[PDB]
Amino acid sequence: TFKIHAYTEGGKPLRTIYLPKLLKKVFLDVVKPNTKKNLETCGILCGKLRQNAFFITHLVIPLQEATSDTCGTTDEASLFEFQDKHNLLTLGWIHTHPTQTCFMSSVDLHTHCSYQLMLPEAIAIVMAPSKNTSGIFRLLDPEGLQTIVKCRKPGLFHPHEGKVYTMVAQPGHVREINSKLQVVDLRVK
Amino acid sequence: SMQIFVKTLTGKTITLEVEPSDTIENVKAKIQDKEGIPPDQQRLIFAGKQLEDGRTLSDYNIQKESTLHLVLRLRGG
Ligand SMILES: [Cl-]
Ligand SMILES: [Zn+2]
Ligand SMILES: [Zn+2]
Ligand SMILES: [Zn+2]
């Protein structure tokens, strides 16, 4: 049985997520046509729970739309059909900032809050290819989650008071390993 | 008033108290109240189809101890 190597700010245990070290590069390769057109792209990190640790085994690129500044799913029923019939857990997500720096935006935090409420270990990977930087983030728990849950500020992109998020602990929360990765691109063009 | 279940894709099952007359939007509001997820991020699926906001549980013949499935939208910026 795998053991706990990371904790939330409130002292809650976080099970390890094993991340294929090729995932970041593969994601950039798969979404390169969009990056070239200055369009963001997102993906879902899917996997399994085995003996008290999570394993990311699939990178899923869902049906979606985008601009230079945003990306979003458009057919979650299609995504559900895949995860349900393959019995894969949602463990986090990934997206590109084609021109921007590596950080979690207002949209990113509002989105990630819900994933992290549903799975305390849920992670958000952000790729900033024009900067050759990347990051793996989560909200501060409980304080960051509380702030985002309570937030009703207008504007697609608005700031938040103080620190709401952090880089995840590595390798304690996320450990990058040499492991199998399947790509599943559900897009129709 | 009856119990229904909402199973996530993360190994979590949410238990809700509802009535057959509750609309899907009412259900999403209950999920927000209890779990903190905004309704506009929620997609609910039952017996293979995504449930429309305006319709009721009884419309989809959702009865007691039925399980709905929650898939979140993804929005990035
Ligand atoms: Cl597959
Ligand atoms: Zn906000
Ligand atoms: Zn597979
Ligand atoms: Zn972002």
Swiss-Prot record, chain A:
Swiss-Prot/TrEMBL domain comment: The JAMM motif is essential for the protease activity.
Residues that bind Zn(2+) 2: H110, C151, H158, H160
Motif range (JAMM motif): 95-108
Subcellular location: Cytoplasm; Endosome
Included stretch of the parent chain: 247 to 435 of 435
Entry function: Zinc metalloprotease that specifically cleaves 'Lys-63'-linked polyubiquitin chains. Does not cleave 'Lys-48'-linked polyubiquitin chains. Plays a role in the multivesicular body (MVB) sorting pathway. Required for ubiquitin-dependent sorting of proteins into the endosome and subsequent trafficking to the vacuole. May regulate MVB sorting through deubiquitination of ubiquitinated ESCRT proteins.
Naturally occurring in which organism (per UniProt): Schizosaccharomyces pombe (strain 972 / ATCC 24843)
Family: Belongs to the peptidase M67C family.
Binding site residues for Zn(2+) 1: H95, H97, D108
Site feature (Indirect zinc-binding) residues: E40
Domain of life: Eukaryota
Record protein name field: AMSH-like protease sst2
Residue intervals of the MPN domain: 16-146
Curated annotation (Swiss-Prot), chain B:
Name of this protein: Ubiquitin
Coiled coil: none
Organism whose genome encodes this protein: Homo sapiens (Human)
Residue span(s) of domain Ubiquitin-like: 2-77
Location relative to the cell: Cytoplasm; Nucleus; Mitochondrion outer membrane
Free-text description of this protein's post-translational modifications in UniProt: Phosphorylated ubiquitin specifically binds and activates parkin (PRKN), triggering mitophagy. Phosphorylation does not affect E1-mediated E2 charging of ubiquitin but affects discharging of E2 enzymes to form polyubiquitin chains. It also affects deubiquitination by deubiquitinase enzymes such as USP30.
Origin: domain of life: Eukaryota
Function: Exists either covalently attached to another protein, or free (unanchored). When covalently bound, it is conjugated to target proteins via an isopeptide bond either as a monomer (monoubiquitin), a polymer linked via different Lys residues of the ubiquitin (polyubiquitin chains) or a linear polymer linked via the initiator Met of the ubiquitin (linear polyubiquitin chains).
Modified residues (ADP-ribosylglycine): S1
Record cross-link Glycyl lysine isopeptide (Gly-Lys) (interchain with K-? in acceptor proteins), residues: S1
Membrane topology type: Peripheral membrane protein
